[PDB]
């Protein structure tokens, strides 16, 4: 099954990626890195989230609407895997890519809150420095930034942790084991998918959003009330 999939992988690779990665994935001098040994997971992350192709050299690549569908993504990943392998996709017990089954070490049918606690402390330890407390993203040096984690599915999160896309450090499966990674996924999805008890969240950016809101519009409405109650002379 994979042997014929690799052919479509090659056909798609020849028509898009050579200009940056070479016919033999060796890379190009300043135009793109070598893809030997990156594996299925890096290709899946890069193509499925739509980061590749990169049509402009920049401080950082951008997520966008993907140029290929799922089957084409797996075909290109199979072709790249044939050149040296690498980290692999997390296949579930039936053979499909794992989605919604990575939400915690002890997932049954709903997010276990103990996993959420451990994953919250893990995310605060490692991930929250570049992203923020709830994964709303953050800034870096010279025009680079850490994206907001609301866009990615669970497989993309796992392969992001595994591969270290551009400036993200790698988190191998022996630094952060599968239980730790799945608890991190559980915490990310819990924070994403739970409404704030205290009303509208103001984006959860912290003091900046709350400040801007009050110190512009909250005081503006009260001076409007004062003008209603007072006089202009």
């Amino acid at each position: 099954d994979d042997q014929a999939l690799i052919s479509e992988g090659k056909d798609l690779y020849d028509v898009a990626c050579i200009t940056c990665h070479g016919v033999n994935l060796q890379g190009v001098e300043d135009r793109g890195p070598s893809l030997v040994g990156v594996g299925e997971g890096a290709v899946y992350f890069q193509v499925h989230s739509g980061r590749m192709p990169i049509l402009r050299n920049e401080a950082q690549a951008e997520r966008k609407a993907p140029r290929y569908t799922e089957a084409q993504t797996l075909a290109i990943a199979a072709y790249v895997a044939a050149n040296g392998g690498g980290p692999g996709l997390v296949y579930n017990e039936d053979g499909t890519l794992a989605m919604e089954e990575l939400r915690g070490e002890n997932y049954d049918g709903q997010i276990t809150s103990a996993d959420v606690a451990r994953g919250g402390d893990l995310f605060r330890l490692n991930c929250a420095s570049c992203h923020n407390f709830t994964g709303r993203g953050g800034a870096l040096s010279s025009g680079k930034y850490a994206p907001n984690l609301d866009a990615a599915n669970e497989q993309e999160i796992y392969q992001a942790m595994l591969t270290g896309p551009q400036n993200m450090p790698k988190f191998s499966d022996r630094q952060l084991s599968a239980d730790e990674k799945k608890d991190i996924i559980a915490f990310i999805k819990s924070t994403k998918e739970t409404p704030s008890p205290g009303g509208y969240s103001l984006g959860s950016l912290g003091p900046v959003a709350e400040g801007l809101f009050m110190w512009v519009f909250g005081i503006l409405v009260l001076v409007a009330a004062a003008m209603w109650i007072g006089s202009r002379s």
Binding site: A114, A117, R118, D121, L122, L125, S172, R174, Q175, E180
Partner: protein, 51 residues
Amino acid sequence: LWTSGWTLVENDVKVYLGRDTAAIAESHTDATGEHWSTTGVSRLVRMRPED
């Protein structure tokens, strides 16, 4: 301000580089009631150079 934990390595103690496992305390419940235990867990853990 001249000292830290690593000062214990001043020819006194063997000090490993401990990684944080972020482990919570674990609950245990029976007829006596639910109580939390840290007797079987460890937050800091040693690490080999291939991790």
